[PDB]
Amino acid sequence: QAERNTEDGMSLIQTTEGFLQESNDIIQRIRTLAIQSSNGIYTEEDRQMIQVE
Amino acid sequence: LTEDQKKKKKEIMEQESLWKNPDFKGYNKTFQELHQLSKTFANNQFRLALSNYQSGVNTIMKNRDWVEQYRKEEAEKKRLDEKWYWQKVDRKAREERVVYREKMKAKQDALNYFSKAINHLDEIKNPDLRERPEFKRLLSDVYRSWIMAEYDLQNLPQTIPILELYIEIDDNEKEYPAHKYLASAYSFEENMIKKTKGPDDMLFKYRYKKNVHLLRATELKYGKDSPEYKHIVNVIN
Amino acid sequence: VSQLIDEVDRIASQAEFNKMNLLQGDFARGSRATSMWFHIGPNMHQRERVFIA
Amino acid sequence: TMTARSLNLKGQSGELLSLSTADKSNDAIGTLDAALTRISKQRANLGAYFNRL
Amino acid sequence: TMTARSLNLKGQSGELLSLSTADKSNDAIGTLDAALTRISKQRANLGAYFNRL
Numbered sequence: 001q002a003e004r005n006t007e008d009g010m011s012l013i014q015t016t017e018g019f020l021q022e023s024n025d026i027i028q029r030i031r032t033l034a035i036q037s038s039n040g041i042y043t044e045e046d047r048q049m050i051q052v053e
Numbered sequence: 054l055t056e057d058q059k060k061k062k063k064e065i066m067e068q069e070s071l072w073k074n075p076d077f078k079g080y081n082k083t084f085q086e087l088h089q090l091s092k093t094f095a096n097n098q099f100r101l102a103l104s105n106y107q108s109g110v111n112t113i114m115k116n117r118d119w120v121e122q123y124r125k126e127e128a129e130k131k132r133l134d135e136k137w138y139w140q141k142v143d144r145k146a147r148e149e150r151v152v153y154r155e156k157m158k159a160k161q162d163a164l165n166y167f168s169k170a171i172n173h174l175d176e177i178k179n180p181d182l183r184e185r186p187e188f189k190r191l192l193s194d195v196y197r198s199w200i201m202a203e204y205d206l207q208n209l210p211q212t213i214p215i216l217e218l219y220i221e222i223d224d225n226e227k228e229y230p231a232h233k234y235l236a237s238a239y240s241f242e243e244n245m246i247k248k249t250k251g252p253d254d255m256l257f258k259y260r261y262k263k264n265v266h267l268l269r270a271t272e273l274k275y276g277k278d279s280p281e282y283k284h285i286v287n288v289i290n
Numbered sequence: 291v292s293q294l295i296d297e298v299d300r301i302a303s304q305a306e307f308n309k310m311n312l313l314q315g316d317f318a319r320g321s322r323a324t325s326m327w328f329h330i331g332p333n334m335h336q337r338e339r340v341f342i343a
Numbered sequence: 344t345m346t347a348r349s350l351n352l353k354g355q356s357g358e359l360l361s362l363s364t365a366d367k368s369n370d371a372i373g374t375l376d377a378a379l380t381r382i383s384k385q386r387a388n389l390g391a392y393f394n395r396l
Numbered sequence: 397t398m399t400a401r402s403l404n405l406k407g408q409s410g411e412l413l414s415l416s417t418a419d420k421s422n423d424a425i426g427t428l429d430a431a432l433t434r435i436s437k438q439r440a441n442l443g444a445y446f447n448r449l
Contacts, residue, residue, distance in 0.1 A: 006396045013389050013396070020386045023344065024379060031375045037355055038334060038368045040327020043308070044357030049437060051355055053444040134339065139317075143341035146318040146325055153323070154356070158366050309429075322357065334369035 029053075058276065065229050065274050072197065072230040074205075080114055087194055090187035099188065102173035106195045109166030113202060116159035120152055153206075160202045167199045189223040196222075200234060209238040210245070232270035239263035264289050302343075317343055344385075349378035397438070402431035 033050050036042055054062075073079055084107055091103045127148055135141050174192055177183055196219040203211045216235045220226040243259035245251070268285050275281040302313040310326075317325060318341070326340035352371050353363040365371050405418040405427060418424050 010393055010396045013393050017386055017389045017393075020344075020382060020389070024383050024386070027375060027379045027382065031372075031379070034371060034375055035329070035332060037365075038372065039329040040325075040337070041310075042329075043310075044322075044324065044355075045433075047355045047357060048359070049440050049444075052441055053447070139341040139343055140339060142318045142343075143325070143339045146323055146341070147327065147339070149318075150323055150327075154367060157364070161364075324357070334372055 061274070061276065068228045068230055071228070072201070074201070075110065075113060075117070075198075077114075080110065083194065084110075087191055090190050094182075094185060094187035096177060096182065098173050098176045099191065102170045102195075103191055105166050105173060106170035106191065106198070109163040109170065109195075110198055112159050112163040112166060113198070116156060119155065119159075123152060123155075124148065157206060160206055160208075163202050164199060167195050167202075170195045186223070193219060193222050193225055204234065209241040212238045213242075227273060229270050229274045232266040232273065236263050236266035236270060239266065313343055315343065317341055344382060349381065350374045397435065401434060403427045 033053060037047050037050050075083075087103060087106075091099055094100075132140075132144060135144060170191075174188070174195075177188065182188060196215050200212045200215050200219065203209075203215075212234060216231060216238065220228070220231050220235075225231055239259050239262040243256060243263055246256040246259060268282075268289060271279075271282055271285045303311075305311065305313045328338045328340065330336050330338055350366075350370075352365040352374060354361045355365050366374075403419075403424075405424050407414045407416040408418045
């Protein structure tokens, strides 16, 4: 049963991790968008469109 | 002059000093008098409220020192690609941006601190304590720095609810700068309606409030039925 | 010549790119100071200078 | 984790319909590295944890 | 969206067989920029929406 407990823990951890892959892929996408936003000739109107995303 | 005009002259100068842009002697004086009051008050939530307010002004004071240092460091750079008029114009404008953007962040941090000072004052529930001269002065000083932090960055519409809360406290309504800033901020809002072709009800609302505080500032500094009072009344009527 | 002079003032006035006016007196500031800041590298402090009038 | 896991910068310089703006572009970029760094390495903790199990 | 999404100008000064005319040409041009701008940005929001899904 202790072995089972160890394994059930693995599933919790993997579930948690999957939500973190989603979350980190999000940051990487935000970073891509942040770089575009940091372009001083990229306009305020266009920056609003990026901020939607 | 009359005894009241001499008294008035003294008071207007003290009020102009009260609203002076912050510096190191005024910072010391302002916090020393605010330190006097919280001492007598002996209230942990007021103690915290003052701690947060002072941290807010410290953000502003640290920024003012940064702004001189930044401009200094830029002035001391040799700029080889700045031989044409447009090149100097660009680099000047970019300097103003970094100063403005950093001042904007310093203002936002300072207002988070002022908001915390107010949130702690909100926790003083006893009406016998809220009516204390100690309580009212700090709440006034928090609002004043909040007004000034926004004013310096041209965020005039935002200054109105804070100026209005300010003048409701312990005879602040008799302060000439408070009415001058209200009148100026209302004037801005009137102009916004005229430029954006907004509704007439708001045009007249803002115009009315400009004229009320214009006339009241005039009355307070020059006196009722003075050549200056009579003039503003005749323009409004 | 007179029309050529006016034509210059008109070129300067209406010469837009991406709805930005690149020649008339909207520099160094208009309603906002937004002008030609370029972000050339992937990180900040990788920028270049453009004005013209 | 939640959006307040990092300096959760909202909006961007210019005219907005919100009451918030991002901070110094260079720090905003640094912030996204901080966000990614803090969360990605936490995944490493779960990764390492899985290996423990 | 519908035709009344922008200032829906029809006809033009002079003799017509309709009972409507366009307004100041310069503003009519500005209006069509508004029309095109408003819809493209709405598409951009949907575009961004697709990426969310």
